[model samples]
Target: VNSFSGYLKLTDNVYIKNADIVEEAKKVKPTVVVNAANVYLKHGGGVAGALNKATNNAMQVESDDYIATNGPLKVGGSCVLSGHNLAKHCLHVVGPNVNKGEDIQLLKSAYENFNQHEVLLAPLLSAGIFGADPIHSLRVCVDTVRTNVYLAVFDKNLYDKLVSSFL
Candidate 1:
């Protein structure tokens, strides 16, 4: 199986090494943004780090409670969860190395039901929880949601580009 359910394409591709995630966001003006990073993931000279940097002890979850829809409500090690909730109407993101099964299903429900027809901006998995290969995890994510999709890759150093051509 391809691991992806919908469509896939590469158009208007542009790569910038170590680019700022927020700046990239500004450039894309995406409809919806998904940040698929872990509590410790960092990027772009303290720029993208803002998203990962924990402010209050609000989003920190126990190592045992790393599941997506589980405890901690805030797991970014920082309170950036609130920021994301406020930044976009629909954001379907999970922490590092999600435990598959329920974890994957949780994201699937959130993306399909809560985030359908919305732009999905996500990054390659780098929390070591899903292994070193980010694209593989991304492919799973792409497969989970059977609707319109827009995956955002923060650390890929690439600007916004269409991975799937839906027409």
Candidate 2:
């Protein structure tokens, strides 16, 4: 494997890359991995789905427990769980969905709600199946953080575009 000592910055302290997020998380061993989930704790699709499956559905159980005690997670709200297969912790954020008109403020709020950590692994909030614009979602993702943030993009074309435009 090639040694990569550089990163593409979407904003100050926020980065973008094309990689398997889970694999990258394994390598970096970040403190937290953020998954975009809805209030129902049903992480059966989108980024949440991948994470849930990777961690053997530990995230779902943790999210369900959170719901049982705190009720449905509100937009911008979050729940942290013990990471089973990736980072040391898992942060599940209630992200805006297509039905929500792609509320950028809510997306920003979700990012802002996360607890501080040395490193955070996150996806392009509300983009893809959630139907938010990648550029707009990325903007909010970058603006809300003040620490090391890795935004994972699986599509090469999207990754190249973001790198060319932002890096």
Candidate 3:
């Protein structure tokens, strides 16, 4: 059920839900789905893992092929490719991985990079295994994205906090 969640007063297009982004992907077939990728553009864990699994690892194979040909992407860089199944296209974005000393500037660059697209479906890029604090990453994403954003999050607690910002 596509029940009403909460409207983001920002642009009337943002929707925040404590739901599976993979399930959301089937509904809001945006222009592109953003993958929180490592510099290698690897689709192995976190949101990448879920997206790859949903697409039956097609996204992984495409990512692998891309890095193989052009080499790994840099922090704050991005690449686009066919969605394979889960979307029309996929934007592989590299954000700051605290484990590697990458931080807010790089994450901001990633948001700025993806903002080029008109409609975007994304997550809090570095807030998972990459180790960025969720709130900071969320704020960065909120400030940087200019298009219609369908932001999907995973935790109920996180969802509660995030929705408050829109009000």
Candidate 4:
């Protein structure tokens, strides 16, 4: 099933989805796919790991070199890795650590840095390893995403819960 909310201007262009992120990445062929990452750019687990694996570690090399040259990323900061398998680019943003209350603000800042793209596919920031509520995270994204946004939720159960609660 699919549902949407256009309650705000920024949110009007956003699509909250319950589907495989990787498939969506392939189907949408977004200009950029945003990933939540740490300063180290390890892509060891969670969304980052999945993306790295899908792209055959292309993001890993670029991301590591980016961090190496530009210094460690600060919270709310972002860097772009040119794409490999699907998207034309991968936008990595440093979100808050687990359960941090500043997640919304940090996510807002991260989204602000993505103004150049017309279409973007992003995971629900702070809602997974970062331990944020999916509903809140969706709201944060809705308030920030300036382009047509596709928010992918990987877990079926979690996706259902979020749809029930909001959509």
TM-score list, all predictions: 0.42, 0.86, 0.88, 0.84
Q: Evaluated with TM-score, which candidate comes out highest?
A: 3
Against the unseen true structure, what C-alpha lDDT does each candidate score?
0.37, 0.75, 0.77, 0.75
Once superposed on the true structure, which residue ranges of model 1 sit more than 4 Å away at CA? 1-20, 37-48, 52-71, 74-87, 90-92, 96-117, 125-132, 154-167
Clash count per candidate: 9, 0, 0, 0
82 Cα displacement, candidate 1 (Å): 6.3
Task: Give the runs in model 2 whose Cα sits over 4 Å from its true position.
Answer: 1-6, 100-102
Tens digits of per-residue lDDT, candidate 3, 138-167, equal: 777777887766778888888778777543
TM-score of 4: 0.84
Worst 10 residues of 2 by lDDT: 1-10
Displacement of residue 146 (Cα, Å) in model 3 is: 1.3
lDDT tens digits by residue: candidate 1, 1-167: 21222223432221112344454444554555444443433322222334434322222232223444444433322222333322342143444345442243233333343234344444443323443344444444455555444443444323223132221
For candidate 4, write residues 25-120 as lDDT tens digits.
777677788887877888998888888898888888888788778888877888877867868888887877666556456767766765667777
Candidate 3 collision pairs = none
Query: Per-residue lDDT for 12 in model 2?
Result: 59
Clashing pairs in 4: none
> Which runs in model 4 stand beyond 4 Å of their true positions?
1-11, 99-104
